[PDB]
């Protein structure tokens with residue numbers, strides 16, 4: 001039957017740093033990775049800032065010759081994938097390669113790449129479209145390229161479920177191992193949507209904070225002055241591993257993955273139900289899946305996108321699932337500092353959640369100066385809060401009424 | 413032990429018709445759906461033909477208002493999903509809605525919408541980007557929109573595994589049911605990449621047939637004159653159902669899905685290994701999953717893309733897997749008539765594999781006028797072949813070395 005699943009490796013690019021420890025240091029210090037965007041000219045855009053990955057050197061991972069053929073999202077996913085695999089100390093052999101797979105996803109994928117070849121197509125013509133446009137841009141090629149580079153011959157796929165992609169990717173990889181389709185999976189996601197179509201598209205839908213004159217205070221989840229999410233780039237990857245396999249080889253285990261929930265809201269293409277009915281169903285499935293009393297949950301890492309409707313939905317979802325225990329746990333949004341990595345949001349927040357467990361600290365919600373109507377839970381405003389965390393939960397919600405929950409606990 | 417999964421409903425948009433019975437009539441008569449592409453200037457392109465969905469009326473499915481928000485690939489996916497659900501006679505209720513989920517995917521997604529919003533971005537700047545650009549273009553919106561429209565609250569997600577997408581979607585939907593996460597799933601894929609960026613993308617990699625003089629003859633898997641694949645558009649969708657839930661409501665069962673294989677080649681970003689190592693591993697994994705010996709397999713719907721390296725690698729794979737049984741089974745490429753629907757290839761080709769079981773006939777590989785070196789198997793050249801079929805394989809292989817196999821068995 002169902003095997004248990006532990007975290008043996010983590011890798012990350014965020015607007016807070018080029019690895020996990022540097023990113024985490026910023027999280028505990030309540031530092032913002034949000035700044036005006038420099039790689040393009042956004043004077044015609046209603047939003048001109050985001051969470052860029054700053055100082056990324058792809059030639060720490062790939063030959064410039066390969067890197068040139070690949071969209072930044074693919075570069076970011078490989079960067080985090082390679083970190084996580086090295087962090088696991090796992091050796092890939094002919095003996096285990098067929099039992100090691102990969103599920104790295106993206107919400108949008110190679111939008112910069114499609115934008116640039118679109119430029120070439122319209123300004124010059126079809127014959128200037130790169131021969132590398134398809135394999136360098138489509139979402140499954142983080143899983144593809146990682147498998148080619150490392151010899152991973154296990155299950156090879158990618159999810160695209162918008163802002164839920166990282167949680168879905170991690171959770172379903174765990175089910176791969178749980179049910180014995182694999183002993184190891186590299187799982188998470190990557191996003192680089194900070195191009196014309198991305199900032200314009202989200203801008204057109206009026207979803208983005210337009211606080212161009214103070215980018216670091218734009219992402220203010222549950223604050224009454226919130227005006228949309230902040231668009232950020234990066235990657236999260238975890239090495240998920242069957243528990244006995246991890247023990248046999250003496251792997252360092254950060255935490256166990258005990259619970260995964262999915263659920264459609266069936267409510268609206270882009271709007272979350274104000275009652276949190278979808279988040280509620282999802283967390284309930286995931287806590288059942290983990291065989292837990294909801295009162296065991298100590299820390300929740302919220303979706304916490306800093307949109308009006310999304311944030312309030314999540315208070316209502318947590319009050320409804322946890323009843324009075326909603327006032328005992330701590331809930332925070334690391335999106336306060338990183339902004340919204342979209343399909344990678346689930347991945348980086350999975351790792352922040354595992355790190356709350358290791359270090360016994362609730363990350364802060366920075367910029368929560370004036371909590372909104374009903375937002376009366378412990379939201380770890382401003383400053384990290386050292387506390388007892390046995391069980392941590394990470395929530396994601398996306399367009400299509402798509403929901404995911406991951407439940408982690410300490411392994412000893 | 414594990415719940416059994418059956419097919420109770422099927423839906424399709426293809427170059428051979430706007431539904432399954434019309435597509436299947438096409439298939440068994442050896443008709444081509446390939447023609448010069450219209451309503452689009454391909455003067456500057458090396459390929460000017462493909463498999464277009466001819467005569468599609470989205471308003472049979474959606475309001476004009478709904479449909480104007482959504483890329484053709486999503487319209488195609490919804491059409492297939494709606495056909496399939498209706499074909500199943502499933503009643504969605506408050507009692508069962510949490511146990512009905514969706515896994516509809518795409519290889520490439522919303523190229524045509526990205527192209528048109530790009531046209532507007534480059535000519536007039538970002539204030540001409542549709543506010544429905546993002547949710548109207550991202551790959552999870554077939555699953556999103558279907559779930560919202562039918563009120564489905566089960567597992568809500570999408571796969572994107574290039575030309576393997578449709579197969580992976582159906583396969584991992586089947587897993588959700590087997591391991592009791594859902595009782596019903598709508599699964600498959602949709603694709604409409606016949607924009608400048610698709611034909612130009614694949615054209616730039618010289619992956620496409622350039623036989624503009626005889627478009628019906630361009631797709632010729634295992635023929636010595638083949639010169640790359642034909643780009644085709646459309647959708648497949650299956651209603652997957654746990655057996656006891658099918659029988660309890662007196663569902664018409666087309667066939668049972670007994671076996672699912674995934675596997676990475678870990679070989680090359682675009683190229684398959686010459687010896688079908690990947691396809692071999694994947695078919696072996698799928699037959700082991702089904703608890704079947706290779707001698708039990710009667711019909712294989714090949715990937716059969718009409719690429720020099722792709723077609724011959726599949727011959728290698730089958731010979732390696734089926735040894736002294738490889739000439740006994742019939743193996744045909746329906747891409748000989750449909751061309752390559754990319755991420756929807758696996759969905760439509762799963763349906764054709766189910767109807768091969770229902771009607772006891774192997775669909776032809778048309779245009780196999782001169783089989784290449786080593787292509788001495790029963791590739792059902794030119795005409796449909798009635799024969800005994802108890803076990804059917806549908807193989808899919810994609811960029812990133814991503815493999816998928818589905819094993820269907822007759823039900824009586």
Ligand SMILES: CC(=O)N1Cc2ccc(N)cc2C1
Pocket residue numbers: 472473474494495498
């Ligand atoms: C043409 C056809 O087969 N259908 C099935 C179906 C199901 C639901 C909705 N909204 C619309 C339609 C149209």
